Symmetry: D2
Subunit: 248 residues, 4 copies
């Protein structure tokens, strides 16, 4: 098998490297990843500027200022010569991608792009902040990839996986989950600047205090891997009949 | 009624101002919008830095380097004092937000954030490049808002609206649509830089040549307004049973 | 005569357009300017990515994400076919470039680049914040250019000009000035974020209260145009003998 | 003695850490450095937004998205409580800062800011691209600091130091140098994009082929440390008389 592996943190990040090393036992890992951390910025496909892509080593390429989307598309069309890999994999992200924040994630968008191209795809993110054990986390990622190669991913779906920052042997198990609503309370704090004008800080309070069993958040907060099947197609087909009044 | 109106192009853009002006006949428009165009960059909610918010005029505020998400959240919690408006509206965007590219749109994410907060929400984008007639487009936006205030938006949904760049009287009608694929063929062009190293340009070819009836792209290409009901919850519930093998 | 006119605020800014229109009576104005405001970001010459340059109208070009430096160099080598114009002009900037802040200015760096290429060069900046009268300011810019074409700029020098935001007839005169030291008092304000960690705001207090006659700041604060001759060569030749101990 | 040490590459960079470690034998090193690499972006002092500053360890702080200028000013006013250190040091930069390009350098601007504040200051940059031996380079930096603490830096000056990427014992010596031009030939290459529109690549050719003895470039190209004394005051006083015609 062959995997196209991308990320959002950069080709040098411990998370993509840990995953690449672990995956070698299942097949050929072809890395195409940004040359910098793009977590904070745009993730769309670049149509209107060109992109440098440089070979770091055999099957290991970087796209200079390339988004995960750019990496997936250049990986597939240029590096793999339009031969679909078995999987597109994105991660392991340096931090979680849970709940409503999935929409803004570059790691998730890499997997989405693979699925747009007709390739089964998985995003992997670490649920931790400090001293993340990426080599431990990679072990469960590889367990998942092995099973997916055997059994496959259902229609109109790609997988969003979050792994607790635990040693492999301490992971409680793997749970299929739904996307949660934000597992925190939002509070805005007001300040006055040196010139007398207001400014604000949006604070996240009480993280996970009210996590609902069945959600991605609850799984990882409790020591389980979360695997959420995401729709590729965002259309709410069921409810179209209820907005046909707009056509009148 | 009261509307919280945001955008991604900046408070000064002709699209947000056209929509603001037109909406006055339906209720009170409270604008909270970025001070710059953020189309090309990140759109997430800002938790890690504070945000300046400046009053431009009555019910008209800008958030300095604030994403649409920031604007919705500060608009709701600070400006509206946690009193939900009737609608959160985002746009009119300077350019379309169709198909697969909806995931990357700041305009769409503003409407998403409204719906996350429990408020019915609509994104409006102009399907044009040059000489966009924002005041003509605003007329059909207000027609839609009027109907939505009367009839409402169904479960688990927010609306994504694209309007052709036509005079109001030339719009053929309004269609309820699904999210299309990408209505173009992707081709990568290879170049060699001055130092002998490769670079690539991802080109979009044959735009709309194969547009499928029923999609957002087809509607706007043919002179109709497109209204797509989008899921807020990305979870593919139907297929969970088919990935429970991952729990074994 | 022919002028190569650049700026840092973008080809559409009122300041570059006011200057371009006024200069037509002295010669041919060839504009090459960024497609966006680059005041807040890097200004260096781009060596390692390519640059799109698009014709807006005859003798009026934009460099997409091009710094003033890129604009000067592409203007000279591509648009002017390596035929030196009589002057490189940069501005009129939307805000001042005085004192120690000159080092960080994109408007000033455009003029510097012209001088690096062996062309006499002038930067123009407006000393105002709100409701800047760019067409009034352009009148004095043109007065200066006319005189410079007649008499010339001395060796190893380019000019840094700041113009008060006054009607042309209210300008008191033009003064040759030195670069001032920052005409304000710096104070740092401390705050505590929602999570209990410190943050700081560097404030500028008492602007111009202690301005020294002879400086750029004093001239503009008192209603005069400031013209400062700047060194191109930063080397302090006089003092080399006093650091030769480092060679021992 | 006490040194305030900043850089532009980030607090984690091998260059700043190598220099920090080496300097401990001469006095107390207080580091205040950005949390990310800011080489490609703006370097000005931040007046319009607040700045988070986090303690990493004793006498080791980072300013979140803080320019070198921000770091020097917060280091002096907050960390050092307005007690001037013996020196402000900036570097060791990951790459050179030679010739005309000094104007655009964040590393150089950190040293400039120290001298603006009335503190003797030195910028250090590595003349290398790959496999830079920062610990070897730090040895000659400390040699220079030791001498400067003994003998001092002359009027209106701060030092700009570039060190070849050589083992300490292979460095040929230290030379006092002037700012060179640009030691390369500029050539613009033209391309056509996938849509038929032009784009350009500014190339640097023949690097160092014509380096002039006495310049910063020549010294480092030939295995010597370059130390250039730079003016803080950019004013060309000598030539003021030759532009007084502008006052007429
Ligand atoms: Na990331
Ligand atoms: Na936009
Ligand atoms: Na500017
Ligand atoms: Na640097």
């Amino acid at each position: 098998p062959t995997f196209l592996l991308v990320n959002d943190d950069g080709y040098f990040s411990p998370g993509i490297n840990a995953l690449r090393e672990a995956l070698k036992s299942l097949g050929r890992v072809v890395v195409v990843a940004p040359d910098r951390n793009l977590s904070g910025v745009g993730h769309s496909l670049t149509f209107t500027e060109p992109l440098k892509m440089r070979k770091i080593d055999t099957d290991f390429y970087t796209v200079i200022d390339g988004t995960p989307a750019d990496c997936v598309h250049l990986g597939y069309r240029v590096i793999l010569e339009e031969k679909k890999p078995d999987l597109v994999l994105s991660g392991i992200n340096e931090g979680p991608n849970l709940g409503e924040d999935i929409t803004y994630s570059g790691t998730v968008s890499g997997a989405m792009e693979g699925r747009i191209l007709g390739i089964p795809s998985i995003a992997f993110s670490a649920f931790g902040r400090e001293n993340i054990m990426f080599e431990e986390i990679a072990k469960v990622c590889v367990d998942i990839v092995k099973k997916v190669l055997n059994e496959g991913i259902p229609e109109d779906t790609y997988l969003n996986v979050n792994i607790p920052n635990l040693r492999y042997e301490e992971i409680k198990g793997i749970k299929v989950t739904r996307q949660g609503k934000r597992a925190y309370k939002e509070r805005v704090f007001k300040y006055i600047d040196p010139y007398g004008k207001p400014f604000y800080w949006i604070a996240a309070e009480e993280f996970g205090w009210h996590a609902e069993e069945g959600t991605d958040y609850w799984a990882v907060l409790n020591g389980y891997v979360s695997v959420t099947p995401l729709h590729l197609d965002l259309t709410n087909y069921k409810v179209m009949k209820s907005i046909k009044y707009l056509e009148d």
